[PDB]
């Protein structure tokens, strides 16, 4: 789902852009991963288990 | 002769004549080049808000 803005006055005179960031946006694989790389962002491990 | 001069004057008569129908489908087809014109806008707009 590219985002093509026309820019010049011609057939192809564009370009494309892209964005992602959410809640899981933390380190990504191609997925983001399992119990690693999505809670970091989403659900911090700061509940005891650093104790 | 005669019939060759004044047939000659009508003729350019109507020569002119066909000359002003030009004018008027040429003043109609000026704007419809205009029209085109906006639509073209209208397109390249529409380009970009593809986004």
């Known amino acids: 789902k590219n985002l093509v803005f026309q820019i010049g006055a011609n057939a192809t005179q564009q ?3 892209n964005i992602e960031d959410m809640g899981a946006d933390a380190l990504g694989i191609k997925e983001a991963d399992g119990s690693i790389a999505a809670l970091h962002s989403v659900n911090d491990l ?3 288990k650093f104790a | ?6 047939g000659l004057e009508m003729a350019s008569k109507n020569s002119q004549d066909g000359i002003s129908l030009i004018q008027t489908a ?3 087809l000026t704007e419809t080049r205009a029209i085109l014109q ?3 806008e209208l397109v390249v707009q529409a380009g970009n808000t593809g986004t």
């Open chain 2, 1 to 6: 002769m005669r019939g060759q001069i004044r």
């Open chain 1, 15 to 17: 370009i494309s852009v």
């Open chain 1, 46 to 48: 700061d509940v005891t």
């Open chain 2, 26 to 28: 040429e003043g109609a």
């Open chain 2, 38 to 40: 906006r639509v073209r």
